[PDB]
Design a protein around this ligand. Sequence first.
Ligand code: ADP
Ligand code: ADP
Ligand code: ADP
Ligand code: MG
Ligand code: MG
Ligand code: MG
Lengths: 49, 535, 523, 523, 31
Amino acid sequence: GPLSVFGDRSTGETIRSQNVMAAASIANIVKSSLGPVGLDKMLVDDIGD
Amino acid sequence: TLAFDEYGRPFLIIKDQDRKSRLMGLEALKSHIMAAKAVANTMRTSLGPNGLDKMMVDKDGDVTVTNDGATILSMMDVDHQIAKLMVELSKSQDDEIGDGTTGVVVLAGALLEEAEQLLDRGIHPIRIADGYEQAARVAIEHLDKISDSVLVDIKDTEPLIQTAKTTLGSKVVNSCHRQMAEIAVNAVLTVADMERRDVDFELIKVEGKVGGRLEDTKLIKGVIVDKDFSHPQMPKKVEDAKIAILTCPFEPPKPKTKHKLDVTSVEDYKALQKYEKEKFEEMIQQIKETGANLAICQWGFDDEANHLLLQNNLPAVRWVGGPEIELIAIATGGRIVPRFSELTAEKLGFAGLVQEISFGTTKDKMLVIEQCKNSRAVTIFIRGGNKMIIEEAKRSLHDALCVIRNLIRDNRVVYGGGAAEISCALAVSQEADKCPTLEQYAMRAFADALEVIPMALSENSGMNPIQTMTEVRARQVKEMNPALGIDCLHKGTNDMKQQHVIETLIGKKQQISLATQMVRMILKIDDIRKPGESE
Amino acid sequence: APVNIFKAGADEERAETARLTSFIGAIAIGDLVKSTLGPKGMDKILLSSGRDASLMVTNDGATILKNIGVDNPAAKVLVDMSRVQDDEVGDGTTSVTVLAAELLREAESLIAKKIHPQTIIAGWREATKAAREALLSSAVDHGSDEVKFRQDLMNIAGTTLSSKLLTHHKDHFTKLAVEAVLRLKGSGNLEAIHIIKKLGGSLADSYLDEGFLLDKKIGVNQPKRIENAKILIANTGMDTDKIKIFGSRVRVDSTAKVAEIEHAEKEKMKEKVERILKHGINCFINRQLIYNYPEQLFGAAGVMAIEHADFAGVERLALVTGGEIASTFDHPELVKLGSCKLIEEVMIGEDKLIHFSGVALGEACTIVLRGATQQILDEAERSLHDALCVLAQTVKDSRTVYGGGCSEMLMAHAVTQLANRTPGKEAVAMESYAKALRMLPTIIADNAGYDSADLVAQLRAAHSEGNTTAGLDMREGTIGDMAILGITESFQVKRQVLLSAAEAAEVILRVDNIIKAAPRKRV
Amino acid sequence: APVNIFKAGADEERAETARLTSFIGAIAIGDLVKSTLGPKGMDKILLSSGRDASLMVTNDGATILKNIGVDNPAAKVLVDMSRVQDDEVGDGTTSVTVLAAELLREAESLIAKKIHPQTIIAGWREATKAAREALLSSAVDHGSDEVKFRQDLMNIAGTTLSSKLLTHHKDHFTKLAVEAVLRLKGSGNLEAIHIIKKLGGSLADSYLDEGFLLDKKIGVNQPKRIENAKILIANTGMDTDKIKIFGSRVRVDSTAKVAEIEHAEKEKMKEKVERILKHGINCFINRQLIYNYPEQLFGAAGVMAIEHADFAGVERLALVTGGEIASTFDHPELVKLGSCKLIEEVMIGEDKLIHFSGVALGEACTIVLRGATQQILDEAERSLHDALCVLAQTVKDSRTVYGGGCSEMLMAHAVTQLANRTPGKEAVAMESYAKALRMLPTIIADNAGYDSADLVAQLRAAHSEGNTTAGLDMREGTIGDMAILGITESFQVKRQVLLSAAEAAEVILRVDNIIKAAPRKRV
Amino acid sequence: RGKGAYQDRDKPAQIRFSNISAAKAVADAIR
Ligand SMILES: Nc1ncnc2c1ncn2[C@@H]1O[C@H](COP(=O)(O)OP(=O)(O)O)[C@@H](O)[C@H]1O
Ligand SMILES: Nc1ncnc2c1ncn2[C@@H]1O[C@H](COP(=O)(O)OP(=O)(O)O)[C@@H](O)[C@H]1O
Ligand SMILES: Nc1ncnc2c1ncn2[C@@H]1O[C@H](COP(=O)(O)OP(=O)(O)O)[C@@H](O)[C@H]1O
Ligand SMILES: [Mg+2]
Ligand SMILES: [Mg+2]
Ligand SMILES: [Mg+2]
């Protein structure tokens, strides 16, 4: 009947809404570090750096 | 993303959303058709007189071989909500008419298979559903063209027998195809109220006992109960029975409240012995003063009352059921008496040969009522070689009792064997061009799905579907359309009027009406919100 | 339905494994009890895994199939088929199981021949109709001339007991089975012949009692034997009556009135026994229990008292003595008493039983089965039950047919004669019906060790030109006349073997889909 | 041996489940490939559970059984039987599997008849001896009059390719198979016909090349086409020789002597190429790899250089050009060169191959199979391999028999004529041998959808009185003459179907005990 | 008359619909 792939398939407006939230997840991070009133961040690693 | 927001917060809408299943897509309609076609392909092989039966096993290990479409889909463990609606579709045909429970599932799966190719062309699913309503309306009006019956329930039982042979021809009762067909005709006409056109199936008792053969099934005018003569020396044959039906146990009268009767002296204890000794002589004499020679009691008997039955020559049965004695008072014309003091000669029942019959080596000894006087209650005694052939004959003959009931509700008939489906398919194709504005493709998908039922009869009979259907459909256009179908041994010609394949009008009228509305509820759905695992 | 399966734990199959599991499960049932068919077939011993296994050896095909518990769905139809055969005629439960399995084995041969299964059903319905006329036209009736009917009844019991454990006891057990039904002189109730199984002694030491045997010996201080007595039985309560008034207490003011009530209770129990001895009796049988207060009253009057025989024990005493139950004692002129000669107690297997020797109107018997083990007594009881049930229906239907393979070749000849007057669509299914009827003398011939390929070929050549009474002789291993050797069976037994196997094979052959549901508590 | 078992993890069975598992496991092999027999039978698609499953559709019965991996012990005898049939004659691997299974299916019918299994073996040895005389007396030889032998060879390839995927390609693929063996003009080595499978195009676009195709294209700066050239091949090392003295070093005192040694190494490698071009050649094929230093020498002289074709690629070039391998270059008067006309490069499926057009003494071919998918190319290669192997043996043994069911009815008639001249002990086994030979036209007739119950019955009535060339016509669905329609098979192919199935059924029927040992790493 | 009857009680009538329904899912995936 359906596709017999062993992975995962998502069609329609599901991925069309997921790619915007994937791009907005990156833009909402770097929005606080733009312009002369922007502020720096902290990038802490698992090893402690 | 799912279960997380773009700001890092957890995104939870409903509870346990990770173990949910939701499909809107374009395959949500495709999953409903592939689940419904597999039910229709299962029921396709059990259609017609050459339809092969199915073996159903219950959860307890009991095996029942069924052929009717109502009991097949009901005894499944299908956990699919689209196929569960096909179970209630075959149940709705059994509750209303009760003859086309197999054909209403193949027709519903045929409308969804033709709608699959219409869905890929870009047609809206409600536009197909609105096109099926305008196409099924033509099939209802065309089915009422040729319809006539001459049943008078006096001597013209010949249209009634041939109507029941169409229903019993597909079951396993074809060895008794003439004997058992006449049983279901006379069982309805003796209990039906022709002034109201109402038939009550509570008056038709269907009992079964293993032993004998299928040819030993007789229509017993009366009642058949388990006889429980408390005395083993009771006479087992009454020639003329004045039946005294009572609902009081043969005992001293016990009240319904708490009494705690007090005994003080020895004169009160000797009064206890004379009270019960005169009570058992009063309950026996009040039956003999009415002239009765047979008693029926719902409750038990006392040991002191058992020997008083033999001294007065009064046979009596013990521990009869609730609705069983309700059938005795109608078959014998008597009245059910609450007490013993209200017994009279007018409340007695009349019966002829009252006897018990032992079946082989068992100890059942069922009641056989041969003679009666204007009874309104009959009992069919189904015998067979095993319990598989009896429980199926209880389901096969019940479909034969329903098609006679539908003739009293509506005295119009059609001709089966695929003759009515080909004639209705030509009516939709003629009105598809008047006018082919929007719903031209939806009406032609209805006419191509109406031809699945006669081409399934050609497949089960060993013929070719597209070769036999093209010959029958072309002969109805070149001349005026007769009752032209098919058969298994084909009986020579293909004329259904000569082969006496007669079906009810309202049977096929509800086959097209219920399958169209069930298709509309499974086409007008674009989401599934089923859960995941059980726990 | 296998593709995109919409079931939870249930599985199904359509036209591929449906008829495959139906033909495997039904042949393996028929091949199981194949070795128990015939006068030289062996027996089975049935055992469980434990927890009071209760081993029960049986040769009858109904008792084997009712205890195995087959998991196959189509095999339960043949199990239920042999259950009705034991309940209706009591014989041929093994013969109806092999015949219904040989029909489906010939139907499995029609799988590769591409025959439609509805054509085999229509071909077997015409074959069964031709086989009914072969048994009906060859049935031998017996009306008057009763010295030939009693000789015919010994051929029925001699044929049934030859296929059981009672092989070399046909000189005794045939007389124990014919005279038991002959003493009924009426309807075949099949409960007046009370079979008592006692250990010790051989099967030749078993006998049919001329009177009646019972348990629950005569009182404490009562006489053990009374000559020329009048037997009165009862079904009434003796002591601790609590007579039919629920919600009645003894509410007194002093304890001296309680002594007057309990003396008045014992006076009414004494007056009830005084109403019993006004009939002029010497023996008393009560279905209920007799306590100590009426037991002293019967012992002082010299009257026996048999307490709590059985619920069906007073029914057999009413048929062997000629009395009535008489649960109420208020009219001595309307109560008929029994008759006997000796009520002495006999000892059978170190157990004292009450022997009702010399009874009048004795329409009841008592078979005293004595065997080496309990396994022999459980087999000889079912072997005698398979012989008394046929003789109880042979006196109701006196039509008899010639058994020992002679009836099966008469049925197979009528099908083959009408198979040549049919077109080739249904003629192949009728030839498979006649080949399965010839398998029933083939199983009997091969169980003894004879040449089954030649003896059935000699039976088919004999029945093709005359010889309506020619059958299989299992004594010497040849073909002989069945009217001379005296190997006959009942007509209703041989009809139910043919008719129930044709109906049961019709159900399984019409199955194209086996949809089994998900079972409970099976993981 | 089951009772008081003296084994650790091994089990066995004797005479009850030994022949039961042998008859179930062998019929299920024969009923599997039953649907692939005949010119209207379907094909199978073989798949694994994963881990490079490599799906390979095959209709030939040898390739199906060699990849399924049956766990049954007796089924591996029929699996190995079809492997030998593919290795000897290359055809009839499906026909020998169903025939060996139909012998054991008739032997399962002799279980209930109580026939001794050694009587069935001795009955089949006389039946197989009579069946050899039916094929030997009906074989049609072809000596002179070669215009009727080439028409007879197209009937062999037309019958073999009719039961494969090449159904509607008999107007093309018959000429590709007959002319491929006809261009050998000698022994059937079955390796000069190199089949090249390329994607793109239909099966009608496939063709037989008039020359020869190769890979590993001509150098870097070498000419791509030379007209009227002399082809010289080789099997020698070009560069980095390390010539045959293990334990030889260059032990010098300064690095200036290493420059003189490596210049002396390149002078001897240049002198080796100068000995090659003294023959007067234009093309060079080396089985080993050609490095950069001799590649510049062949490019400067205008000589081609084909490096590392194949180990068996220089054998096909030696048979298509008429030369020799010539691994040593020291006698130009004793080295025979090849001959060609065009060595142009052709492009088949976006791949440049070297076309040896116009070669002399071309006893080698190249079939360029073009298909829609790789599944069709893997099936058409095995379909052509099953067609070229029969024509390679038909030119060695010109005896041909009439196929299409005509040969099996001739073999079954000779057994039935001698089944009536035998005593009844072995005559029943010979009748089962003749019924199994008639199943082979029954499987072909039922695969198309025809009435197999009537067509084989008409073939038995035709062969009973004359009609030695009457067979089954699968075109219209009737009975026709096989000499007119031209449906013939080879004698050695039909003999190996009869002989290997009778020997393999002799082994499995003689097994009464299957003692399987304890397997390793299975728990 | 019916001029014959060809009973086909075998497996691959259902597997033929499995190859059709699987190829329809591929054509609808890249539609
Ligand atoms: N003698 C006959 N000739 C042709 N067709 C028949 C004959 N008898 C029955 N049929 C067909 O067989 C079909 C059986 O339908 P059935 O399964 O009984 O419907 P339901 O399940 O609603 O009872 C009918 O539609 C009828 O047209
Ligand atoms: N003396 C005899 N000669 C020939 N055949 C006999 C003789 N006695 C019994 N048989 C055969 O043995 C068979 C026994 O069948 P049985 O197992 O009793 O059937 P069921 O189980 O239905 O009672 C009968 O069919 C009968 O024909
Ligand atoms: N044109 C034809 N007419 C009749 N029969 C044919 C025709 N072509 C092939 N056959 C039959 O089909 C069968 C195919 O057998 P095959 O599967 O090739 O055997 P194997 O697997 O051993 O090569 C042959 O036995 C042959 O008799
Ligand atoms: Mg019906
Ligand atoms: Mg018996
Ligand atoms: Mg071949």
